[PDB]
Amino acid sequence: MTLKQVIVVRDDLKLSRGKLAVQVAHAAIIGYLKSDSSLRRKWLDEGQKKVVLKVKSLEELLGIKHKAESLGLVTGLVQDAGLTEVPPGTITAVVIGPDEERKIDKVTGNLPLLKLEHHHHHH
Structure with a gap:
């Protein structure tokens, strides 16, 4: 039926995103592997x-x-x-x-993310 696998990341943490992003990236794998172990092999196959x-x-x-x-x-x-x-x-x-x-x-809004950086405007 309608099956979809997505890991959402809340980025833009007013707190230092340096080490916090590092620990989370590691945890993101442990978290991902926790479910991806046999669950992904089931449908994400x-x-x-x-x-x-x-x-x-x-x-x-x-x-x-x-x-x-x-x-x-x-x-x-x-x-x-x-x-x-x-x-x-x-x-x-x-x-x-x-x-x-x-x-x-x-x-989760799967629409293309708008560029929050400076995109362009003939400038």
Whole structure:
């Protein structure tokens, strides 16, 4: 049916993104491997619906990930897994199993990200 695998990353952490991005990148793999172990081999075996997007807001993510988990979907907010005290401090990485690209589209916004950098304007 409509199966979709996507890891969303909440980038733009007013706090130093240097080391925090480093620990999360490592945790992103442990988090990814945690679900990707046998779950990806199940449906992701095709490897044609694997994509990564950004998160709109921590509150919206914690709320929809729970909604996705509600149907028995493997979802969880991935953060410094080595630690387990204050979730804040790091960015908000999340791993979502075979979601329905149909709902992830509106919820995670699969529309091309707009360039927040200086794009162009005849300048």
